[PDB]
């Protein structure tokens, strides 16, 4: 147990840019040892609401694989991201499943994702015909036919663009300030669980 092959947890967190909430990024981590301590190396106020597992007893037990997803959302949306809660972003973008066993880390990023004129690099979906199944990716940019009459691919009355951008400015309050969220979802399969945590002495 030389403790040498650490997991690449820096790329997920220490990233210059984060993917939009409507099109999030998925990365798999395997064949390494976790270093959850680094989790509290930074950020002033960073919640760790681990549902389904003991928040402080995760190092000891070994897991088959871990999945990492990340995005950027508003203030109340970090509350809306809790499993089982119903919300427009919740039922239109991510839709965490009810039987979820993983942690959710949400931290303020006003210093790193706010523009004086107003940022336009972040988009989020407004409305969809049907709700999303858990762990589903939607990147469709087609027009929306709210009514029965076809839109024929042109905007106007009863035909709206599905994606609306945010506007992050420093003058806004805490509720409208940007927040970065990363979710870790653990899994257990027939594999020999090569994601064993650190061992001491």
């Amino acid at each position, epitope marked *: 147990p030389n403790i040498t092959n650490l997991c690449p947890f820096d790329e997920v967190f220490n990233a210059t840019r984060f993917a939009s909430v409507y099109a999030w990024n998925r990365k798999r981590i395997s064949n390494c040892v976790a270093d959850y301590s680094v989790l509290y190396n930074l950020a002033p106020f960073f919640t760790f609401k681990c549902y389904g597992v003991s928040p402080t007893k995760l190092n000891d037990l070994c897991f088959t694989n871990v999945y990492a997803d990340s995005f950027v959302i508003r203030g109340d949306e970090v509350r809306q991201i809790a499993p089982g809660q119903t919300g427009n972003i919740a039922d239109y973008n991510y839709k965490l499943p009810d039987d979820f066993t993983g942690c959710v880390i949400a931290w303020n990023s006003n210093k790193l994702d706010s523009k004086v004129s107003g940022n336009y690099n972040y988009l989020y979906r*407004l*409305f969809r*015909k049907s709700n999303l199944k858990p762990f589903e990716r939607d990147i469709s940019t087609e027009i929306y036919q*709210a*009514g*029965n*009459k076809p839109c024929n691919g042109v905007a*106007g*009355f*009863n035909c*709206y*663009f599905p994606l*609306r951008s945010y506007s992050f400015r420093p003058t806004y309050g805490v509720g409208h300030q940007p927040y970065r969220v990363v979710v870790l979802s653990f899994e257990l399969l027939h594999a020999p669980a090569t994601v064993c945590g650190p061992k001491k002495s």
Partner: antibody
Framework: QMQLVQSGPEVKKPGTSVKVSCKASGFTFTSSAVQWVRQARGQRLEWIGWIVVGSGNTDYAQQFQERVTITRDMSTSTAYMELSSLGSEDTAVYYC????????????????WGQGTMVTVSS | EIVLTQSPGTLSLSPGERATLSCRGSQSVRSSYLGWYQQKPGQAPRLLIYGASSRATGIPDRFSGSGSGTDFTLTISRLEPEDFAVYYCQQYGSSPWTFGQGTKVEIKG
């Protein structure tokens, strides 16, 4: 039931500004639109603009510009219009019209219409 | 700027008759993006025709809509005392939205 209620009559001084409210009840407001039309006594109807509730995008006519603003609120489910530089030509009855929506489907025509608010500007 | 015009200034008739009301557009508009509204003095206007070809809820079949391109027509099969009001046709598709002058239907003996 689907109902639309506007504000009461308004009396203003020339050069001032007027705010008109319009609230809806009984349907999905967050998936509709608001159209504002003002009419003089026995005259032709005209259009001022329209706002989409879903995204807040607004559109205004070329004749009425630099003096018309539109805002909305989902919590109160109410839209508001603001007109500046009031004059004797602004005395009229204002109406807010919306297409009703029972569920996830919305009628192709503007069904719900307000009772109208009388605005008079005089010294 | 899509300007609309109604040829009949008045439609004085008698109850139980058939009335034709035509409104013309300067330029072509969307096929199913025209509406017809009925208004009485001192009251808020009420929609009659939506979609330029259909009928809204609560309106009898006596009012029918037709036309296309730059010209639309509306037909009243049977005239009734409560049908005498002002009618308007408006656009739905172009960026500006406008109204016609408005045709008043009356009774003349």
């Amino acid at each position: 039931q689907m109902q639309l209620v506007q504000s009461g009559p308004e009396v203003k001084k020339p050069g001032t500004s007027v705010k008109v409210s319009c609230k809806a009840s009984g349907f999905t407001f967050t998936s509709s639109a608001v159209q504002w039309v003002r009419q003089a006594r026995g005259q032709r109807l005209e259009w001022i603009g329209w706002i989409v509730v879903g995204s807040g995008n607004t559109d205004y006519a070329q004749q009425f510009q630099e003096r018309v603003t539109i805002t909305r609120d989902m919590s109160t489910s109410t839209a508001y219009m603001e007109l500046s530089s009031l004059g004797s030509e602004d005395t009229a009855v204002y109406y807010c019209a919306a297409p009703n929506c029972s569920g996830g489907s919305c009628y192709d025509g503007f069904d719900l219409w307000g009772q109208g608010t009388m605005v008079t500007v005089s010294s | 700027e899509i300007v609309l015009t109604q040829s009949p200034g008045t439609l004085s008739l008698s109850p139980g008759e058939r009335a034709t009301l035509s409104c013309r557009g300067s330029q072509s508009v969307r096929s199913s993006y025209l509406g017809w509204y009925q208004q009485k003095p001192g009251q808020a206007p009420r929609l009659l025709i939506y979609g330029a070809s259909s009928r809204a809820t609560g309106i009898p079949d006596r009012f029918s809509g037709s036309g296309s391109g730059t010209d639309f027509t509306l037909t009243i099969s049977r005239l009734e005392p409560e049908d005498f009001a002002v009618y308007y046709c408006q656009q739905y598709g172009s960026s500006p939205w406008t109204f016609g002058q408005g045709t008043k239907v009356e009774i003349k003996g």
